[PDB]
Subunit: 189 residues, 4 copies
């Protein structure tokens, strides 16, 4: 019933989103890579900006994700800088560096995801945000998911997303933000 192109370069993101989409959602890969200036202050701003740039060019309904790691004792770092921080380096160096940052510090943290729907024919835009609360692990563990998942432990668990990647589908920020986006969309039709 509703068909959408995904506004995203990230293949792990393509992956997570199709696997939690209801049957009434068809989620297609964008026919083209489109440069987006990601100069927003928040996940919401960047998510909307990707949805709008992609929507205007493709002239078809689109969905966008903007996401990252928020560490409370580091002022929300890396936040929107999640990818850009030490971007020439491996996620493993990034995680080691942030471990050094956190010695002696409260390790509370969250992955946040802003999920955006834009229909450029109707000029309807919907954006919702959700999060998964956890903590940074004392050490990098496991090879599942992507990015910072090897050192993030969701609340109510003692393993990292790198160790129990299947759990992302159930409780991660992206799963909940998009299910909450699907839910709104479902209602308004």
């Amino acid at each position: 019933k509703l068909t959408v192109y995904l506004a995203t370069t990230n293949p792990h993101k393509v992956e997570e989103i199709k696997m939690i989409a209801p049957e009434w959602m068809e989620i297609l890969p964008s026919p083209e890579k489109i440069e987006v200036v990601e100069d927003g202050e928040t996940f919401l701003e960047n998510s909307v900006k990707k949805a709008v740039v992609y929507g205007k060019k493709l002239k078809h309904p689109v969905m966008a994700d903007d996401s990252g790691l928020v560490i409370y004792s580091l002022g929300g770092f890396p936040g929107v800088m999640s990818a850009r921080f030490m971007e020439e380096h491996s996620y493993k160096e990034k995680m080691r560096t942030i471990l050094k940052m956190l010695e002696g510090k409260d390790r509370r943290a969250a992955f946040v995801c802003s999920a955006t729907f834009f229909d450029p024919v109707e000029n309807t835009l919907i954006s919702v945000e959700d999060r998964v609360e956890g903590r940074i692990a004392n050490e990098i563990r496991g090879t599942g998911g992507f990015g910072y998942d090897p050192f993030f432990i969701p609340d109510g668990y003692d393993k990292t997303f790198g160790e129990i990647p299947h759990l992302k589908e159930k409780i991660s920020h992206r799963s909940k933000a998009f299910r909450k986006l699907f839910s709104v969309l479902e209602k308004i039709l």
Copy 2:
């Protein structure tokens, strides 16, 4: 139930949105006169941007409106330039100059309104758009309403909005978009 501020400096817009409020919504003018640079290409971009800027400086749900007159035979002019066009001059003078532009041309026009709700607490953003098709009168009539109302005739009528302003309450771009917004809030709150 739901209090909301209006992300605008326009009294006329505040009046018009105030009068169509649903029973479950409280609608207040914003307590700050915040400057937003309206550099969007489209009414949606500007709407969305006022709502984010207002919602962030206020830390409370906001609604914003970006609106204008679009005259097809003039390329959609004045469009997002509706206020900035000859801004030091009265609307009378603006309407006069646009009448000259239109001599001998198809007179078909629309008012368009991009209506956006932003909740900065949850990060929920909803933006919708509507319009009233109509045409430019051959002369300026009435004093009702505001802006271009005195020379705009909605389809199915022969008086301008400046002549029959009460009719705005029922069929205007602003009345239609904001109801479209309420019907969305209602269904998802």
Copy 3:
């Protein structure tokens, strides 16, 4: 010595810049088409934005031009909208329409040009502006030049730039801005 690419999509601007160029400059068109959202509210802001965006992507010194027609009685219209106004129509039609807007108004106008140099290796940016004061003719005449030339009369002249386009080399907004820019660069080399 100094080679610059021009951060422009306008081949008339290219040829006009080349013909006034000092002996020590080499001026080449951009080797790549790059998209820039011209969302500045002034010429200076758009000129600087084109220079920066093209400079950063080309990794090489560049120059940009933002230019337009400013008519005083019309609040400076079309201004930054010079190109966008009625952009699907010919200039003849955009002129006819502005002729209609000028009936019974003061006819004085200026072309304005913001000329920018950007060296992205040193991060040196230099932006200078000039103008040519004149007035709008009562009709369109000449096929020379480009854009609004055929109804623009320079102060101290009888003929429009469409009739005497050869005079642009000496006295246009573009000739004066760029030579001002060449002269600043002379001193700082």
Copy 4:
């Protein structure tokens, strides 16, 4: 011969620029604290942007500075994020955090400054950039200067700017860049 306002919120920048002002220039703080979203990817873009905004509000010549600390082994961190990083925390906390990140890494870094002049009357804008190269110390020393001074050691010295702040006047990113700017001006004017 020239009264220029400083487009800045930083009392410490105010003082350090003031003290290297050349004879023909009366450098003042700005009368008004004005909101500027520093959303640029580089120092130059933020510098330019602060200059333009202030200069449009104030209608007089202004100068702006955007500056930060660039640590090479950390991908250029904190860079444009130099203030915003851990912004609710003291600079002692920030520097302590960054020492941890640097354990086992190349300590080299630069303070960088983009110094921009903007005349909103003529529409002339000049932006130049400079840097002071140096290294992060293994410890925080001295309460001189500001920000990251107490753990930055300019090349060829053994003291942090925290310990020798009076040498900034002569060798800092800021003095060099602002003198580079001054130099360029008193050729043209």
